[PDB]
Ligand binder design. Structure first.
Ligand code: HEM
Ligand code: HEM
Ligand SMILES: CNCc1cc(-c2cc(C)cc(N)n2)cc(C(F)(F)F)c1
Ligand SMILES: CNCc1cc(-c2cc(C)cc(N)n2)cc(C(F)(F)F)c1
Ligand SMILES: C[C@H](O)[C@H](O)[C@H]1CNc2nc(N)[nH]c(=O)c2N1
Ligand SMILES: C[C@H](O)[C@H](O)[C@H]1CNc2nc(N)[nH]c(=O)c2N1
Ligand SMILES: [Cl-]
Ligand SMILES: [Cl-]
Ligand SMILES: [Gd+3]
Ligand SMILES: [Gd+3]
Ligand SMILES: [Gd+3]
Ligand SMILES: [Zn+2]
Lengths: 401, 401
């Protein structure tokens, strides 16, 4: 059992939960690949059996009458149909556990507070869009954001997958330019090209909200525009740098990841978009300051009158701090839920403590948990962490194109 | 079997073929990644043979006269004595390789430029002290710092070992109180209590340079007051925050790690202090702002009149940046070599590209290469890395008590 130290306090714990790590990661004793971004009925049965065991533990009915009945039921159904169906309460529990198990998620203190929308009866891409609009409406909640997941029908033999082609429900277009630059978000060049290639009439702004490409089984993807008033956005201003508003920067309220696969008890939900609220560094630091994203850092430092001809002035660090201040100020002014990296990492420390008592450990990916600015100012920097894969889980999956 | 390694800022891909050589198993398994953990008789000939082959390939002299001859001499030496002595040039080449192979070292672009003082004829703590003193003065060089290592005698069976008890050659005292808490550096409370217990008269201050505890084989250590004119220190001031000087902060010029064990070709040097120059975040972020170190962050933020009542003002981030500015400015004013984390990480990316061409990869520990402030503002953040152990190497070792 790995010994885990907190270097700020001196605390020492043992991650006994990692011993139950089901699937295998990318590291070996020869080489750690922890920094890489992207590292049969009998086996369906053992995964299902384990998840059902998990579910009946959570309802304090382990080894009980209903527990055996469910195990027998699922085996009977896998024997008869090659698969099985989750009960509604199992789906809710499994979606929460998948969030709880997600090693790169700093917001997991919230894991038990998740609204699960059961769209497993969804029939078409048109119904899928309605479900998604309802998800967006509920989760946004006029700025008082609520964590939610909508679960579309599971992968099943004989039919194609439901897929949302967009990586998030809200994404800004990225248009390749006349010279070769990107106008808008360069992370979204590919999905933007697909939307146009699928009949979308592009804009030419820097913050054009993309349409959804929604794929019903064995169907080409279908284009759906989001009603402008469903997509809550936050114009970005800075509390003391009045010129900052003239940058015309915006970001959207709702982080809704839509391209990940939800795996529960061996069943796979390739379309299961989930959303919470932002941590300000995702926007201020990564989306706005990554060189390959909006890349505003130098322009902001220039406007700040910082000396950008030498690195030792720390103009990059000063400008990024003020971009993050602007993000926090702007979301608070708009009354849109947002958490700064200090509050978020402090709450994650409480999550690790809760999880140590609850399960004997917590899967955590240090390099993703530590914020991209001011890392060692947050308590998670000084916390050793053990990264491993538990199921139920959210998994990356190939793009459908 | 050759890890794909992507740089996410540029999109470029390489393969780490060098990882195929990793001798010492790291702490990770397919089951769980332990990458964030700080600290996770003829065997001698295999490592000697290997290291000798490394030497002769590096000088384009593999499979030619002097190579074979040297292979026999170590073979005969170990047969006749159970160990061997490194040639001068091999001690040199081995020290540079252990530095080159140090996965957590961001300054490895400098690995070819290293001054190696051969102290293998040393005998007694008095001899150590003048060797250490020669090193310190050469390395300090009136503030024009020069990377150096002094290699005290290797380890042999049946006889005690040379050890420096201090973790660094320059450490500040840590004094407990009428209330447990510490004045000075809390990192060094332990060695501070050993020095006092071995006869040193404790000062009262927050920046008393500790005396050295030097240990000749099979002897209790001997205290040594470092010549005060040989410990170059930098008073910390800020270029525009006039009151920053009044905080009385200082740091020393020379980072000289003196508790690590140098291993070359099977031989072990438990006393081999190496030094370079500081990266500014080490002082300004970790040493001065860690909660368990000097923990000055709130004191500077009070002086900057920052709103410390709400974490979302990012007052921690602002105070941290100014402390780092103060470090860089002070060292540059004192004309003491220092490198900021932007220059240091840009140089490390150049080092990665060089090493890719030279050796087919580079052991790099992402969590330590990425600086503790403004992580994603530096290029190494966006560089995937592979971590593994190559020989020769610097290894951690137990405290000699
Ligand atoms: C409630 C507020 C939430 C916050 C503040 C938050 C925070 C974060 C952040 C900052 C990341 C890293 C993103 C990046 O840097 O690209 C992340 C990843 C992630 N989050 Fe959360 N999140 C929240 C809610 C949720 C919810 C509701 C779910 C699912 C039910 C979820 C599941 C995930 C997953 C799966 C990842 C990727 C994890 C991995 O690959 O291991 N999060 N989260
Ligand atoms: C010349 C300027 C140098 C700079 C700026 C530099 C920078 C650094 C930094 C920032 C660390 C991280 C330590 C920490 O944060 O606790 C480090 C670690 C380390 N440095 Fe360097 N360093 C330099 C030279 C050297 C030299 C000359 C040697 C040895 C000959 C060396 C060997 C090491 C080793 C062995 C580690 C720990 C590696 C590990 O445990 O994997 N460095 N260095
Ligand atoms: C930072 N933008 C990209 C990104 C954001 C998020 C994310 C997701 C949620 C629910 C909240 C939040 N605050 N963030 C999750 C991921 C991924 F891919 F890891 F799941 C990626
Ligand atoms: C700031 N932490 C103290 C610390 C500093 C350094 C270090 C060493 C050298 C030669 C240069 C530098 N700039 N730093 C190396 C280590 C260790 F032990 F990891 F090797 C620890
Ligand atoms: C290459 C490196 O692993 C990559 O840039 C990672 C590092 N840590 C991260 N952490 C978070 N939260 N989000 C990210 O996108 C990344 N990117
Ligand atoms: C727990 C965590 O691994 C630990 O705090 C590490 C993280 N990265 C680091 N990186 C550097 N350069 N120095 C350090 O001391 C640490 N500490
Ligand atoms: Cl995002
Ligand atoms: Cl240090
Ligand atoms: Gd003004
Ligand atoms: Gd302009
Ligand atoms: Gd006043
Ligand atoms: Zn690992």
């Amino acid at each position: 059992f790995p010994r885990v130290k907190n270097w700020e306090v001196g605390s020492i714990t043992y991650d006994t939960l990692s011993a139950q790590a089901q699937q295998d990661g990318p590291c070996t004793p020869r080489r750690c690949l922890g920094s890489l971004v992207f590292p049969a009925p009998e086996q369906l049965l053992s995964q299902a059996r384990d998840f059902i065991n998990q579910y009946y533990s959570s309802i304090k009915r382990s080894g009980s009458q209903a527990h055996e009945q469910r195990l027998q039921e699922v085996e009977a159904e896998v024997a008869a149909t090659g698969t099985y169906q989750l009960r509604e309460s199992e789906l809710v529990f499994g979606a929460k556990q998948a969030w709880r198990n997600a090693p790169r998620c700093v917001g997991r203190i919230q894991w038990g507070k998740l609204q699960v929308f059961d769209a497993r009866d969804c029939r078409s891409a048109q119904e899928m869009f309605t479900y998604i609009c309802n998800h967006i409406k509920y989760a946004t909640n006029r700025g008082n954001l609520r964590s939610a997941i909508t679960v579309f029908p599971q992968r099943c033999p004989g039919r194609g997958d439901f897929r949302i082609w967009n990586s998030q429900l809200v994404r800004y277009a990225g248009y390749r330019q006349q010279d070769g630059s990107v106008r808008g978000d360069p992370a979204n060049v590919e999905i933007t090209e697909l939307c146009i290639q699928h009949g979308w009439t592009p804009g030419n702004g820097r913050f054009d909200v993309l349409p959804l490409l929604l794929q019903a089984p064995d169907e080409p993807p279908e284009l759906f525009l989001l009603p402008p008033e469903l997509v809550l956005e936050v114009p970005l201003e800075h509390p003391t740098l009045e010129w900052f508003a003239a940058l015309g920067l915006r970001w959207y309220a709702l982080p809704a990841v839509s391209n990940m696969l939800l795996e529960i008890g061996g069943l796979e939900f390739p379309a299961a978009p989930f959303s919470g609220w932002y941590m300000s560094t995702e926007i201020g630091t990564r989306n706005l300051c990554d060189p390959h994203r909006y890349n505003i850092l130098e322009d902001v430092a220039v406007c700040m009158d910082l000396d950008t001809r030498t690195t030792s002035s720390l103009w990059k660090d000063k400008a990024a701090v003020e971009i993050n201040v602007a993000v926090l100020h702007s979301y608070q002014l708009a009354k849109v839920t947002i958490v700064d990296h200090h509050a978020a990492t402090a709450s994650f420390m409480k999550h690790l403590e809760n999880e140590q008592k609850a399960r004997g450990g917590c899967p955590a990916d240090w390099a993703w948990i530590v914020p991209p600015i001011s890392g060692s100012l947050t308590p998670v920097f000084h916390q050793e962490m053990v990264n491993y894969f538990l199921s139920p889980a959210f998994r990356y999956q190939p793009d459908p194109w």
